[PDB]
Design a protein around this ligand. Structure first.
Ligand code: JR7
Ligand code: JR7
Lengths: 233, 233
């Protein structure tokens, strides 16, 4: 679980019948891929990377130097959290997380765009007097997502059952309580109900983080510490 | 072909067995969608929107108020140029522009991300100074990343030795380099210069090409923030 940083040895080849994920323990982007891997029951190894102290060999896995990164037996590398999720869904057996229908698949991708502003807002909130403006920005963004669910007349962003789009947007909502931003969903009833539905899901439940671990990581994030991603063990 | 602006009547229903594209004659993003429609031989109607004088009804077609927008007989709306292009490839018969292989499809999407900085740079160059030297240097940095792709690929196009989705997706910005007087920005990228020449030889690219006179006419009006710019001719 302890992250690999500068000076760490690169890992060996990926064994046949397995896939590797270069992750970061509290990273919401890497969490997307981890939620898909669990949901689809794919056999995999996790290698945690310290992005605040990146090993030199990791630059060869991804030019952007970001996690998640998938690596297979054939040495093929896949990066960008949405791209890895789609790859896994297409490349592995089981129930498809993404709908077969081209228009419905397009909708999920269109909903993902409606969400695109939330990760950057979250980042700005982690990095003075302007917590007030960011809270007002969150509400504006959440209202758009609520309008989706309202028009859809379903519990999830892709129907009355869970799908890819739910797993993609979930990690940021999972962190609202820890960021002390629960008031930002007070005007969005369907979105509050969706968050409750998510926590009941076995895949979401398995990959959940405690408030103590969330607060611990945040304190170290606010101090721009490289040791932040190794909070606890 | 004359664009619809403020005060124009919204168009009638889309006839069965046809799709509609809300475009803008010199828009590189809507050109992506128009290149796919031509390449796949899809039956469609084009409705040009003046984005510098948007009709009030257009916001009902897209909340982002941007082109391209696809509309079908069932009144289904698809926006985001990449999303429209993938929808068309999946929803219509013929040769697939996107490869069936999950990893190869992922690569196209990974290359698309390596290109993501170019559209914004192009935009900054059009809206104005010594800032022109800095933008030229930024273009070179970006183009070098694309040259590294072609070098490693050891193929003519970004998705093999044949034209595919990824070429059509990045092509409109390179098509405008000559008109923007930015040919010197590809001097250090030989494989990319060869790729641009290969693109111009493609029948789909050739069919949708624009003259230097039309390019310059539109640009002059774009620099003057004229609403009449997209109706140059
Ligand atoms: C992949 C590294 C990365 O982008 N990490 C980030 N962590 C957050 C975060 C984590 C915990 C909480 Cl409570 C809020 C935000 C955002 S980006
Ligand atoms: C969809 C409207 C839009 O984004 N239009 C744009 N036009 C350009 C442009 C057009 C011609 C030339 Cl020569 C350069 C740039 C960029 S975005």
């Amino acid at each position: 679980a302890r992250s690999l940083g500068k000076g760490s040895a690169p890992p060996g080849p990926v064994p046949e019948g397995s896939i590797r994920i270069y992750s970061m323990r509290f990273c919401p982007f890497a969490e997307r891929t981890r939620l898909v891997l669990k949901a689809k029951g794919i056999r995999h190894e996790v290698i945690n990377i310290n992005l605040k102290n990146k090993p030199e060999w990791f630059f060869k896995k991804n030019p952007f130097g970001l996690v998640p990164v998938l690596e297979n037996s054939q040495g093929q590398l896949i990066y960008e959290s949405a791209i890895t999720c789609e790859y896994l869904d297409e490349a592995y057996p089981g129930k498809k997380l993404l709908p077969d229908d081209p228009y419905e698949k397009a909708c999920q991708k269109m909903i993902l765009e409606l969400f695109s502003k939330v990760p950057s807002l979250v980042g700005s909130f982690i990095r003075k007097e302007d917590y007030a403006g960011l809270k007002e920005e969150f509400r504006k963004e959440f209202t758009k997502l609520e309008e989706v669910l309202t028009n859809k007349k379903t519990t999830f962003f892709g129907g009355n059952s869970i799908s890819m789009i739910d797993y993609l947007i979930w990690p940021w909502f999972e962190r609202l309580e820890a960021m002390k931003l629960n008031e930002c969903v007070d005007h969005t009833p369907k979105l509050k109900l969706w968050m409750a539905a998510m926590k009941e899901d076995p895949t979401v439940s398995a990959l959940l983080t405690s408030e103590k671990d969330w607060q611990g990581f945040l304190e170290l994030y606010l101090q721009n510490s490289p040791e932040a991603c190794d909070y606890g063990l």
